[PDB]
Design a protein around this nucleic acid. Sequence first.
RNA 1: UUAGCCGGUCCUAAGCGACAGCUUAACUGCGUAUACAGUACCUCGUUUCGCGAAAGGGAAUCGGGUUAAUA
RNA 2: AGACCUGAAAUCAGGCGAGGUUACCCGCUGAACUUAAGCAUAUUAUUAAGCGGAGGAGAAGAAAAUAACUAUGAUUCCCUUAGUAACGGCGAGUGAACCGGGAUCAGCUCAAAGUGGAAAUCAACUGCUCUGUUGACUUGUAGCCUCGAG
Lengths: 121, 162, 127, 202, 49, 148
Amino acid sequence: KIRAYELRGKSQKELVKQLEDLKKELAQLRVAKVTGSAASKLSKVTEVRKGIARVLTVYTQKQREEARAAFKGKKFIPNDLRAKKTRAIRRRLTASQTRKMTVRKMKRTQNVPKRKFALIA
Amino acid sequence: RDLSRFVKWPKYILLQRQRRVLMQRLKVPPAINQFTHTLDKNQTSQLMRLLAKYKPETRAEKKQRLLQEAQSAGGAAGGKKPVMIKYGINHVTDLIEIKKAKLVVIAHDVTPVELVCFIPQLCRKKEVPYCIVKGKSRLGQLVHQKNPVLAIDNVRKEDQAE
Amino acid sequence: KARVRTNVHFFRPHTLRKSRQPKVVRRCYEAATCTFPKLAKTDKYTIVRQPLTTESAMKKIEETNTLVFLVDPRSNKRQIKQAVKELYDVDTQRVNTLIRPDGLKKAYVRLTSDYDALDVANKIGII
Amino acid sequence: GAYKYLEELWKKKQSDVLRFLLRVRTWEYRQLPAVHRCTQSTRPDKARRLGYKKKQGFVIYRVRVRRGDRKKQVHKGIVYGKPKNQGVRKQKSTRNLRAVAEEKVRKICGGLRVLNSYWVGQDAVYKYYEVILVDPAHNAIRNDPRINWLCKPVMKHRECRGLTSAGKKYRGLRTKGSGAARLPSRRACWKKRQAVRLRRYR
Amino acid sequence: SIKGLSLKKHLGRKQKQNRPIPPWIRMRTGSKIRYNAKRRHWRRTKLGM
Amino acid sequence: VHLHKWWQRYVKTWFNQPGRKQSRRLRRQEKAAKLGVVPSGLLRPIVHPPTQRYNLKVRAGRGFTLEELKSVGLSPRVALSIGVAVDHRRRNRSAESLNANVTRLKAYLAKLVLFQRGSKAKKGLPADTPKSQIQNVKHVKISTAMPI
RNA sequence: UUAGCCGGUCCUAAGCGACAGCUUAACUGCGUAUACAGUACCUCGUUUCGCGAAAGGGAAUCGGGUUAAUA
RNA sequence: AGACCUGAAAUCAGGCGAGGUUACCCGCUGAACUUAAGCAUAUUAUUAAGCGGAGGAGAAGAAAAUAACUAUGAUUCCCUUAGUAACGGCGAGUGAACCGGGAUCAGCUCAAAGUGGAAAUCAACUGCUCUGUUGACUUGUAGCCUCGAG
């Protein structure tokens, strides 16, 4: 019986062995479906094929954590990990570029500031 | 045999030859034809020895120049007013009008020839002397560019008779 | 002044072409100190799905030394030979192969004269 | 300054200096393909004035458009309808050939964004324009503020929607006043007057 | 017959959609289903695929 | 009657009319939340309309005049910070229309309290009002404060 | 419903898609134009890629037995 | 031999385009049924169909403007002008704009000059929290200037 938090302990050698172990038990269940069985047996296929999908998830989860650990704060990150969003969102200019002004429009903005003014009662 | 006459060339080779034919064949106007009238290679060697003396600095030399000023005397008096070749058409046309430029030396090759059609009259109307030199690339080497019109507004004391 | 050329035709020159060398990797399986390498798409298990058991299939196992299996329809005849060798540890003479109306490959696999099929069919439990 | 002298003698088109020089250029252009790149401006005078700047990511294409009008596009000039519409030959088209040229340069340069265009010469069977383009992906255009406005997603294919200089002339936004009262847009103005306005208290 | 593998699978699928609905399905709660609507007889009505 | 065209396409109905009122009215309020102390619009001049049948009447204009602001001694540059419209096109042909709007500006700058930017007081750029500071009411709207 | 040998697969026919470009606002329409062996050193070099036949062209198979239904 | 100029090649390094959606929006292209009690100009209609391009809005926009007044003052939208001026086998039919009252309000920057005691500018790649090495660039990149003045 598998739970996904327990597999986050186990090693990159160990995960592979377990994945293989389940696939044997999944195969020996398909044989019993074909030849002769009861419905007591054929429910156990549902447990184990969700077990397999957990072990693929956890393996791939560790695969990506080491990549993101390594490429952290670095340019030319691999395409596999690279922040999807929309196509349009990816395009555009950074807030800094849209925000940035010329040396001319700096001077007109700077020297005429936003004044808190009021009208008397 | 050598069949280099009879070769079916690419279009780009055929264009850059049929230009040079077509500019011989047509009646050229006097103004455009001005640059057929050029210095001799002995006359041009007399400039390129002169103009190499007044060579404006490399971009790497601006660092080393500025390290000295970064203040050994005091500000801009760390040196004298430095003399050199002035270059780029849109500076040098202003420098003809306000009447500083001693000599104003020009390329025959310049590719959009409209750029330099007017300049020989400008110089003649103001009484500035001018030359024409074979190769815009040769003038580029003095300035540190790839490639028209170079001028001397100012000289040393030693080289002024020459 | 110019090169002495012999052919009347102008041909395109030959240039250097660099192979790709794409700076930084596309997918993170293939990197320095990756250490979780990619698990395989086609294992031995996903090729050889399951044996058949029927009146037609069980007649063959006795006599002609021949096991019948249902296999993945994309699979190759050379893969089935090697996948059967990996699973049950038995060497194959001659695979034949056939796509049922379903969309399922049935592979008839005659085993080598060294081995016996009724040993292997009891080991699996197709019996 | 040299650009003043250039515009002043470019005005004198009929002169022997420029008519020689423009006869030689128009030869060169009709050997090369229809839309092809020049690597620098023929008239640097004129392009500078239309907001060309010689830094990276600005480019410049030539384009050639056939002179004259087009026929109405019917098989054997057989029209079907009322004698007004039986008009094959003397049609005109709404849009100037400068604007057509900007349009030709949608498929060939989909990524590039058109700024402006200018006449570089003409021939009896052709008429030649240099179209100023921009790369909006490039960081030299993207960083600087004065042509960051072209990298917004609104300014796609502004040739196709009629928002160049030459596009804006055929729509008739170049006039304004009583003459142009009719045409926000020709269609937008048309929708406004035509609508039956039914206020809720009548 | 001399069919392509693509056409074999299209045929293949439409065998598998031509069977009576399971008996247990009607028994389940809130279902108005009675006999399969899409059943086809190979003479009566034709595929072209 | 002009209904020979396909007029059913372009029938504009006004069922939104009350929903439009209340959507405008929500964004006037949510504007004046941000402002609070600061009054809304900006000050506009007194102006005779053009042609001879509205020549008697007076209305609000667009914005003042570079001549009019020179008399009082605002810059045309700064005046939009205080909340005065500049209009660089409109002349003063008459002496009478000049002295109306100059009175209107001088009366407004008497009303105008102007807060310090902080920490210390700073003269000019009317003035810095100190922390004496007579009670300003909130946003008055500026048209309703100084009407025509 | 089991194939090295039975066919497809391979070749080209009538013809048909695209390259270079050329037209047209495009949609389309035309499309044979072109710079397409002995790490290093030579010497040759005119055809442009592909589709198009389960009756045309084409590597090689025959006897007997066998299953409820394949040879 | 070396400077340029022009044109190619590459599965070269890193980027961008294509296609989809229809309510509204931008540009082309472009009918006929129908009305006129016939019909051809006219009308339907600068509409439908066709071919392109977008966005949360789009287009428009700071006068080569209205006016002829005591003058107004970007653009858009509403109400009104107005079924008016005008167009029209002056037949059928068509048909705006200014002023006025409101919603909303926001202005601006390039080319045309002047760093010339000295490309001050920009991109790419690498390097510490902003140096170095290539290139672009004088056939003009920064700063300054945009008529309201400069």
